[PDB]
Structure formats: C-alpha cells, structure tokens
C-alpha cells in the first residue's frame with residue numbers, strides 16, 4: 001500500500017534525465033529514408049519506452065502508407081496476413097509483398113545512413129541503435145482501409161469509453177509489421193499500438209479524469225506497477241530462460257480487460273491503490289492459471305495459448321508472482 | 333410543466349428520408365464539376381447537412397470548404413472576427429493586390445454553380461423541386477488566431493485535453509462584409525460546434541444508456557424553436573430581424589460551461605433546465621452582453637449590431653411566453 005507509492009516515486013525520478021539525442025538521429029534517418037522512392041511517405045507513428053525499468057532504451061515505429069491493400073489471412077491465425085495489392089514492386093515475390101526483401105533494404109539504408117554520424121546492429125524490430133542509449137526501429141505498413149474481420153468483436157470498450165469513441169477509434173488506420181509465424185518468412189502481424197496509446201491517456205469514463213483532485217484514478221499507476229513487476233522478475237531469472245516469452249504486451253493486455261470489467265472511474269480511486277493493484281495482480285494470475293488471455297483487438301487470438309507459451313512457464317511465473325504478493329512485494 | 337415541452341419535442345422529432353436523399357445527389361454532382369476548375373480543385377463539403385431552422389425540415393445548409401495552404405491573416409479594424417487574407421497558388425485570379433478578393437471569388441463561385449444547374453455569406457441558394465444554402469469557406473490548418481486564445485473555455489466541462497484536440501483542428505473563414513468593408517472574411521467554427529453538440533457530456537457515455545440520459549440537446553432545440561416561432565409571430569413587426577439561431581446556440585454553450593456536471597442536466601428535470609436556459613438568455617438580453625464562444629472579445633449583443641429596443645422587445649416576449657406556459661408552442 002504505502003510501499004507501492006515508494007516504488008512509483010523511484011520510477012518517476014528516472015524521467016528527469018537523452019531523448020533529444022534520439023530525435024537527432026531518427027530525424028536524420030527519416031530524411032535519407034524519404035529520398036528512396038520505396039520509402040517516400042515514411043514518417044513517425046507517435047520516443048517510447050517499452051521497458052519501464054530501462055529509461056535509456058527507446059522504441060520508435062516508422063510508418064509507411066501502402067495505398068489500396070488487400071490482405072489474406074495466413075491459415076486462420078487471425079493476426080498474421082499476406083500483403084497483395086506501386087512503388088513497392090522491387091519487393092514483390094510473386095504477388096505477395098516480401099517482408100524479407102522490403103526489410104532488407106530498410107536495414108541497408110539505415111546501415112548506410114548511420115555511418116556518417118552509433119552502431120545500428122541487430123524480425124519486426126529489425127534495427128537497434130547504440131548511441132549508452134538504445135532505440136529500436138520498427139517498420140510498419142499503414143492502411144487507411146477498414147479493420148480486418150478478425151477485429152469485429154474486439155476493442156469492447158462501449159461500456160467504459162463509449163461506443164462513439166469505439167466508432168471513432170475504428171475509423172483510424174491500422175498498421176502491419178513484419179512478423180514471422182508458424183517459420184513463414186513473409187507474413188505481417190497486425191498492430192494497434194497507436195490505439196493503445198490513445199486508450200492509456202484517455203482512460204477515464206469521465207472526460208476530466210486525472211485532471212483534478214476529486215477525479216484522480218489510479219489506472220496508469222497500476223499498469224506501471226505490474227509492468228515493473230514483470231520486468232523485475234524477468235531480470236531476477238534472466239539467466240534461466242523461465243520468463244523469456246513473457247513481455248509487457250501481456251500485462252498491458254490483461255490491464256485492458258480489467259479496465260472493461262471495472263468501467264467506472266470510482267473503482268479506481270487513488271485512495272485504493274493497494275486493492276486496485278492487488279486486483280490487477282489477481283486477474284493476470286487467473287489468466288496464467290486458466291491459460292487464456294485474449295488479444296484485446298483480435299479476441300480469437302490467445303496470447304497465453306498452449307502453442308505459444310508452455311504450462312511450465314506459466315506455473316513458474318504464477319509461483320513467483322504469488323510469492324511477491326504474499327510478502328508485500330520484496331522484488332521491488 | 334414539462335408535459336407541454338415533451339409534446340413539442342414529440343412533434344419536432346416526427347419530421348424526412350426523401351428530402352436529404354434528394355440533396356445528396358445534387359451536392360455530390362456540384363462538387364465534381366467544381367473539382368474540375370483549377371481554382372476550386374481541393375473543394376469538399378464540411379460536416380459531411382444542417383437545418384438552420386429546426387422547424388423547417390425542408391431547408392438545408394451546406395458548407396463547401398476549400399483548403400487554403402498559404403494563410404497570413406490581417407485583423408480588420410480590431411473586430412477580432414473579420415479578417416483579410418494574405419498568402420505569405422491557384423486562387424491568383426482572385427487577388428486584389430495582396431488581399432484575396434472575397435468579391436472576385438464569390439462571382440467566380442456564383443458563375444460555375446449556375447453553369448452546371450443548366451438564386452443569390454450564403455453565396456447561392458438552389459431550389460430542388462426544398463431549398464439548400466451553399467456557402468464557401470476557406471480552410472486553414474494553421475493555429476487559430478490570437479483572438480480565440482481565451483475562448484472555447486470547456487476545460488471544466490469537456491476537459492482541457494479535449495480543448496487541445498479541438499484547437500489542433502483547422503478553422504474556416506467565410507466571406508462576410510463588415511462595418512461597409514467589401515473584402516473581409518469572418519471566422520467560423522461550426523465544425524467545432526457540431527463536435528460539441530453530439531459529444532456534450534462530461535461522461536463519455538452520456539445519453540448512451542438509461543442511467544446517463546441528459547437533456548442538453550433537448551433544451552437547445554426548444555430554445556431554437558422558441559426564437560423561430562416568435563420570429564414568425566412578429567415577422568411583420570421587424571423588431572426580431574437580427575436575432576438568429578446562432579445567438580441561441582452561443583448562449584447555450586455558455587450555460588453548459590456554467591453547468592458542467594451531467595447530473596445538472598437530468599432528463600427528469602427538463603422543466604427547470606429549459607427555464608434556466610431562457611433565464612440566462614434573457615439575462616444576456618437585459619445586460620446587452622453575449623460573448624462569442626470562440627471569440628470572447630466579440631459581443632454578439634453589442635449596441636452596434638442590435639439596438640436596445642430590439643433586445644427589450646424580445647425580452648418582454650420571452651417573459652410573456654415563460655409566464656403563460658409557452659402558448660406559442
């Protein structure tokens with residue numbers, strides 16, 4: 001209870017100290033990237049830390065609009081797709097867009113451009129930069145078409161953020177990122193990280209949530225706290241590969257489900273940070289035990305399916321988290 | 333006494349599928365022949381219809397927006413709402429020196445419209461069989477003028493986050509003579525107004541379920557209908573010649589700012605809510621002060637625009653209506 005705000009205090013102090021040096025490089029990369037006719041409309045999506053415990057690790061996403069796409073779902077995976085349709089003809093491999101070819105010149109253009117003042121050296125997160133500062137550059141195809149049919153009954157936020165917001169969110173473009181599946185080397189996975197940022201910073205039922213003292217939720221604090229919890233446990237057992245396949249996308253997804261089941265702002269009063277976090281920890285454990293964690297936008301996709309993560313990893317993380325929660329979280 | 337009001341709302345809602353469908357075929361064709369002329373190439377329709385008179389469902393009004401990239405405005409004679417257009421372009425044919433001619437562009441707009449039909453800010457009125465008013469609007473994706481810096485004060489009602497979203501949207505300029513001065517453009521935020529009306533609650537789920545049914549949208553229609561009815565009952569008296577639905581809509585935006593909580597607009601208290609609406613509007617009429625919601629230093633009820641006799645005439649009329657359970661309904 002009081003220890004959590006202690007943890008939240010030492011986390012916020014890591015933001016008073018490099019993101020300018022990040023902008024100086026990515027703005028130089030984007031210029032020469034726009035010179036190539038294949039990456040003409042390239043631009044930034046939203047710096048963003050995927051790891052809360054790594055304030056020197058940044059993550060960017062370079063978007064590129066592909067006009068008039070038609071997708072083909074790869075073997076009922078509901079998340080991975082082929083790209084049919086043109087300044088991308090050089091990257092064709094038949095009538096599909098080769099995720100391998102298009103990403104190869106992307107790596108090459110970056111490698112050529114970073115040599116003139118950095119050591120770009122590394123899937124979808126194709127290139128990582130070393131500046132004692134890290135940024136990972138992801139290439140994303142933008143499609144202003146309607147969302148795929150696998151996302152029809154996803155983003156169920158009507159009782160929390162309203163249906164007209166859901167309608168407006170679904171009018172936004174969606175993004176595709178080169179992810180291999182099973183590998184099949186030319187598949188692209190859907191991505192709504194732009195929608196997720198819209199949800200976290202516009203998170204209340206009331207429009208004035210977290211804008212005044214009487215309406216101060218504790219959502220963002222709960223997500224930071226369980227994000228930091230997994231990042232810590234991944235570091236404690238890093239040299240043992242137990243928690244290798246768990247990432248922040250899991251805890252962020254479990255957070256979105258808790259936001260829907262607890263739609264009212266009154267259920268997130270900052271006075272109850274302890275119980276709120278304890279309820280967040282419980283739901284995530286319930287997904288570990290029942291081996292079921294739907295993708296928040298693609299509900300037919302189980303992030304915790306037996307094909308992606310084994311039962312032994314879930315049981316181990318369960319034992320770790322349960323031990324932390326019973327001992328006032330010593331890993332913090 | 334809300335029994336009569338809900339009867340009026342019942343009759344206004346029972347009013348129109350074939351009307352708008354006839355307009356959509358004509359407006360779409362006009363926008364295509366316009367798109368051929370080099371001057372009006374990037375022209376689209378803003379707010380992709382709007383009944384300026386809530387009681388006249390056979391009359392629509394569209395806003396043909398035209399993207400103007402190079403914009404450097406010159407505020408005219410401290411009006412803070414009328415401006416001159418400088419270009420810091422295909423509209424070169426309509427320049428009067430450095431000033432973009434609202435006169436030459438109008439006569440241009442007048443001409444090409446009348447060609448494809450083979451009546452005269454609302455540049456043209458067309459008559460289908462139902463009439464539609466078409467206005468031309470320059471769109472500027474630049475930051476809003478400094479006269480709007482202290483306007484749109486919704487931070488305690490819709491949140492400051494929403495205010496920042498709104499101000500990042502483009503603003504629109506329409507031709508409007510000012511005094512007259514023949515080549516001025518007036519500011520326009522009707523796109524922002526529409527956003528506020530259909531997204532009116534402090535809660536994002538307002539009027540979306542039985543628990544959160546408000547009466548904001550009901551009070552504005554009743555207010556608009558009250559003015560339009562008194563304007564017809566005294567159309568020959570010529571005293572209400574200058575009162576329009578924009579005055580009612582502006583005053584409604586002030587009472588939403590003044591009453592930001594959704595619980596203050598419950599649908600059970602429609603009676604008191606409408607009574608509190610008309611009282612603020614009468615208070616504006618007596619004190620002769622009604623700030624523009626976006627341009628706060630612009631008084632819509634200044635003595636230079638409307639004379640004191642007109643405000644007192646309308647004041648006595650609304651009070652006589654409010655004192656006798658609104659017989660004009």
Ligand SMILES: Cc1nc2c3ccccc3nc(NNC(=O)CCC(=O)O)n2n1
Pocket residue numbers: 079189190191193245247249295298301
């Ligand atoms: C940013 C992002 N977007 C998605 C995503 C989108 C749709 C469906 C499943 C998805 N799963 C994951 N992560 N799953 C992992 O195990 C991480 C390692 C990896 O994927 O290589 N992410 N991460």
Ligand SMILES: Cc1nc2c3ccccc3nc(NNC(=O)CCC(=O)O)n2n1
Pocket residue numbers: 413518519520521522574575576577578579624627630
């Ligand atoms: C759609 C719209 N936009 C504005 C507007 C914008 C900025 C400043 C003043 C403004 N005044 C008005 N209405 N004025 C009247 O009601 C009198 C008659 C008239 O002005 O023609 N409107 N109406």
Ligand SMILES: [Zn+2]
Pocket residue numbers: 203204209210215216217218219
């Ligand atoms: Zn909040």
Ligand SMILES: [Zn+2]
Pocket residue numbers: 532533538539544545546547548
């Ligand atoms: Zn409402």
